[PDB]
Write a protein that binds this ligand. Structure first.
Ligand SMILES: [Mg+2]
Ligand SMILES: [Mg+2]
Ligand SMILES: [Mg+2]
Ligand SMILES: [Mg+2]
Ligand SMILES: [Mg+2]
Ligand SMILES: [Mg+2]
Ligand SMILES: [Mg+2]
Ligand SMILES: [Mg+2]
Ligand SMILES: [Mg+2]
Ligand SMILES: [Mg+2]
Ligand SMILES: [Mg+2]
Ligand SMILES: [Mg+2]
Ligand SMILES: [Mg+2]
Ligand SMILES: [Mg+2]
Ligand SMILES: [Mg+2]
Ligand SMILES: [Mg+2]
Ligand SMILES: [Mg+2]
Ligand SMILES: [Mg+2]
Ligand SMILES: [Mg+2]
Ligand SMILES: [Mg+2]
Ligand SMILES: [Mg+2]
Ligand SMILES: [Mg+2]
Ligand SMILES: [Mg+2]
Ligand SMILES: [Mg+2]
Ligand SMILES: [Mg+2]
Ligand SMILES: [Mg+2]
Ligand SMILES: [Mg+2]
Ligand SMILES: [Mg+2]
Ligand SMILES: [Mg+2]
Ligand SMILES: [Mg+2]
Ligand SMILES: [Mg+2]
Ligand SMILES: [Mg+2]
Ligand SMILES: [Mg+2]
Ligand SMILES: [Mg+2]
Ligand SMILES: [Mg+2]
Lengths: 61, 64, 50, 76
RNA sequence: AGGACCGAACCGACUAAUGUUGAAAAAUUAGCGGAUGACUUGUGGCUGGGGGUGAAAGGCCAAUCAAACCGGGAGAUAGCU
RNA sequence: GUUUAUUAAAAACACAGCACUGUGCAAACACGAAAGUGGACGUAUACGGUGUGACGCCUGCCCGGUGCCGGAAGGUUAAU
RNA sequence: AAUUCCUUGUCGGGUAAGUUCCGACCUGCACGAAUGGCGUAAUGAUGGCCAGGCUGUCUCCACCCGAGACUCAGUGAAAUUGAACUCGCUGUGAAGAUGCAGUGUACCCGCGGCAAGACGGAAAGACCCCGUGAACCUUUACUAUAGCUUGACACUGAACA
RNA sequence: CUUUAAUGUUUGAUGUUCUAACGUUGACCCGUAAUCCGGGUUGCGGACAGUGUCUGGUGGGUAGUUUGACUGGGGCGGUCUCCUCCUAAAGAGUAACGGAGGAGCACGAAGGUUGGCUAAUCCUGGUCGGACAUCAGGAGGUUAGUGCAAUGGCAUAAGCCAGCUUGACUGCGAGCGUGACGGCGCGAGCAGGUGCGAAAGCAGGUCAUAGUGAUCCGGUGGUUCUGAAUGGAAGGGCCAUC
């Protein structure tokens, strides 16, 4: 459920940017680039989430 | 075939005694109010094609 | 932009005129000035000024 | 903030260094303010261009209680 | 009875190997689909190049085609090699 | 069933079926400067165009934009 | 999902183990109702997955029969090619060296084999950019134009409301 | 005039009747043993339909073309002319998709002159009143101000206020700056005529450097310069202007 929340943020994020493409306020370059930071952010938030999960999984097992 | 004259340069330089050409000064055709009287007054007389341009004017006016 | 062009035109015989601009918006009162009419070759009044 | 504009250089400064003989009329200095001031036989024009009112040699001085440069033209 | 079923001739061309200065400018070999049908085939006819024809692929129109071939304008033009 | 003769046989094209639409016959429509001809020696249970694609259950909301079908008091508007 | 970017989403199933598959969830980046939606018996040289049988596909290759390859005789090509007395290294260098420097090594010449190099052969790169290049194709690009459509006048007349 | 109504005059349109142009891809007759065509007879339409010329709309159905360039490949973004400063190496000039900002105006006074005046900032006092509203004094001394970016100037002020005024002037211009050039700028002085000043004198816009647009094509005013036989005229030129 958590990764899912994280990801939903991936989704608005790209949405915002995606949208700053028309209204040419961003170079197609700009755009790729950023969407990548968002990926970086998302992977990171997740790996955290999985550290946590693992911490606990240790307990339960 | 007779070289044909650049019919339009002939309408803008007139050949002069010693050999140069005289022409009218540009910049005196409109947008006039905004220009100085000194300025305009000096663009009234005619003028001699420059050392650098004869080349081109003679080129155009082979029968001048 | 905004500032209209106008002629001021010899009050003497001649059709000769000087040329200038005014702020029509805030100054609608026909401009008017002694200027030199080089035709009559004297200094006459010069009127008109939209 | 988006740079990369400049204006064309107005070709300023001294045109005739001290001692140069000039003809009445010539331009001894171009300048925006009166970096130099007109002295004797030197007119200052309406852009502060200083010129010669007289043929002579160019003379630079610092005169004045304010210690200002002046350009004059001595007859030669 | 049937754009029905298996299967030669016939018509196709799905896969593989060979071949690739080939036996061949598209094939051979083993397998493959159709096989009374919108089937297939001989002879002749008709449709012509911004035109034809096309169960549509921009396919086909004489070993080719996002505009055939031949002759002409013609030594087009080539700030390129 | 068709298709890229010669790298694609397919999920693409076609299909029966469905719908919209045009067409009253010297039909629409198409080949034609035209005459002519096809449509058809047919006649709306016919014929062209377009989309969808057996059959079953079905096919909701929006007509502002853009088409088209109508109306029309007004505004502007061609030759003359 | 022939649609899902994150994505091998999560759960379930199948497996020793399954990024595929099947069944589920809804978080549908970006399904959806004749540009049809969801189903569907049959059909399919159609796409994905599974299993039995099968096996040289494989562990891992062995032997064998045939056509070549090899030798003799006859005939007799090809692409290519500035010229060659045509080695390895390490360096240098228009920057990846048979050819330069240094050095190592090598008696002269075939034959059968193998393809690591000769940036090997073939086609004046198809990608890329350039040219005020070409050509098709699109459209509420520009400009024209066949078609269709509006009116006036002409062929075109007489009465009337 | 409003608004209205009505006979009439003008001009349009709309409808109905007719038949004789015109249509007939109804019928029958002859050429003619012929599905063509022609002529004829008849019926049906009928000045409509249709066609020519002119005209408005529609018109990727078709056609010719256009669709910039810089760029640390191209594209995307950004940029394109002008002005100030730095880079720029103490004359000039000097590049980058180098670092910073501004212009596409404003003003008949914000111009000319003659006379006159002089800021900021802080301290101290005292109405509201504050760190800064006005006033006093002192300090200070141009940090202020300059219509606007930045640089250079400015006290003799170029800063600020008044009076009179139109030099924001017409012809020219020795001489010089700066540009490949087109051009741009500076200029004493000369003639005419002016404004201020008792007068020496100052004034051809504005402290200066941005505030811009070649040529062609026309438009407007002026000048007999030209005027296609001649006199005029159109048109053209010249000067001012859009
Ligand atoms: Mg003129
Ligand atoms: Mg059968
Ligand atoms: Mg095939
Ligand atoms: Mg076979
Ligand atoms: Mg069979
Ligand atoms: Mg045949
Ligand atoms: Mg295609
Ligand atoms: Mg062919
Ligand atoms: Mg062509
Ligand atoms: Mg030719
Ligand atoms: Mg040639
Ligand atoms: Mg089939
Ligand atoms: Mg093929
Ligand atoms: Mg139909
Ligand atoms: Mg379909
Ligand atoms: Mg599934
Ligand atoms: Mg619907
Ligand atoms: Mg479907
Ligand atoms: Mg031999
Ligand atoms: Mg080596
Ligand atoms: Mg090497
Ligand atoms: Mg060998
Ligand atoms: Mg080999
Ligand atoms: Mg090669
Ligand atoms: Mg090449
Ligand atoms: Mg090429
Ligand atoms: Mg076109
Ligand atoms: Mg470019
Ligand atoms: Mg310097
Ligand atoms: Mg230097
Ligand atoms: Mg001032
Ligand atoms: Mg004074
Ligand atoms: Mg105080
Ligand atoms: Mg005449
Ligand atoms: Mg005459």
């Amino acid at each position: 459920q958590a990764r899912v929340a994280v990801r939903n943020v991936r989704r608005d994020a790209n949405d915002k940017v995606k949208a700053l493409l028309k209204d040419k306020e961003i170079s197609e370059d700009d755009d790729r680039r950023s969407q990548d930071d968002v990926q970086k952010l998302t992977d990171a938030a997740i790996k955290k989430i999985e550290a946590a999960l693992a911490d606990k999984e240790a307990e339960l097992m | 075939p007779k070289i044909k004259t650049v019919r339009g340069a002939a309408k803008r330089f007139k050949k002069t005694g010693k050999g140069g050409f005289k022409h009218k000064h540009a910049n005196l055709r409109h947008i006039l109010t905004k220009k100085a009287t000194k300025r305009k007054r000096h663009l009234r007389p005619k003028a001699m094609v420059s050392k650098g341009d004869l080349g081109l004017v003679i080129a155009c006016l082979p029968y001048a | 932009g905004i500032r209209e062009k106008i002629k001021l035109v010899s009050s003497a015989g001649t059709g000769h005129f000087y040329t200038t601009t005014k702020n029509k918006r805030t100054k609608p009162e026909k401009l008017e000035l002694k200027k030199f009419d080089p035709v009559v070759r004297q200094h006459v009044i010069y009127k008109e000024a939209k | 903030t988006r740079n990369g504009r400049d204006s064309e250089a107005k070709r300023l400064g001294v045109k005739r260094f001290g001692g140069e003989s000039v003809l009445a009329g010539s331009i001894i200095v171009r300048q925006r303010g009166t970096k130099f001031h007109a002295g004797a036989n030197v007119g200052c024009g309406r852009d502060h261009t200083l010129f010669a009112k007289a043929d002579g040699k160019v003379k630079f001085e610092v005169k004045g209680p304010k210690n200002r440069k002046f350009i004059s033209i001595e007859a030669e």
